[PDB]
């Protein structure tokens, strides 16, 4: 403490 | 100089997914990790590949469309520092390409390992369930079963006329410098009878000073789609503008949108009956702080006049990282 994501930047 | 594909000279080993099931809507992801051995010798320019199936991606909610669908990947190095390979990832073809540096020229019998984050493919795995995820490395297939348990976008107050809205940031451009983001809003996923309905899109949650997002007539583009069959919307928040299930009604919301208040867009939906999808194309500043957003829906009862309800929905994304190392012999 609704939804959340995730990803990559590579660097 | 990217030269020869030496998949036939490299072999992968000890493949395991970090975990086989998660919730992409609660920042769930995983990792593919493996060793690899180069039977023989190679030189600067030789390369090998890894390939992702339909079910997964390698970039996740980070958008690389404004970057030629190519995402750079952390250099693969030796113990003593020097880079052994430069790695890249193609979003469209889901292809990891590792191309060797001159380091490998005067070396022999190269061994290595990598760990790369894997995310869902919201478009191609749009529903919660168990998908096939067979990853290819060096012309060798590794079978896995992946399972996405999405937190349902169908969320809201538990009255037959209660406000219900959800959203998700499914694209973020961190590479270009353009600083753009794509967010899908699900207005009324419960598709219950709502009266005098209003929708607010903020790019800051509670504190303006804490979210990089920017919402105004300049930095924000909105598209609105009347849904026909809510039964067919994605659990992943992916929304296809050209889906026949969606009917763009953007031309009906000319005098129903406001950017007057700071970092927020108002949408006067009014008396609605169906679910509506709102595609958001926005931007974030260069303050370097995180992108945090919030969508709020409020309404009355069409039959009563009283019975107010309001509902909020927060969004934010997390970054994962790839890793790799390798070595040969100094002779
Ligand atoms: Mg092989
Ligand atoms: Mg404003």
Residue numbers in the entry:
A (entry chain Q): 315, 318 to 327
B (entry chain A): 210 to 540
What does the paper say about this structure?
ClfB, an MSCRAMM (Microbial Surface Components Recognizing Adhesive Matrix Molecules) family surface protein, described as a fibrinogen-binding clumping factor, is a key determinant of S. aureus nasal colonization, but the molecular basis for ClfB-ligand recognition remains unknown. ClfB plays a key role in establishing human nasal colonization by binding to the human type I cytokeratin 10 (CK10) expressed on squamous epithelial cells. As a bifunctional MSCRAMM, ClfB also binds to fibrinogen α (Fg α), which is assumed to be significant in platelet activation and aggregation and has been shown to contribute to the pathogenesis of experimental endocarditis in rats. In this study, we solved the crystal structures of apo-ClfB and its complexes with fibrinogen α (Fg α) and cytokeratin 10 (CK10) peptides.
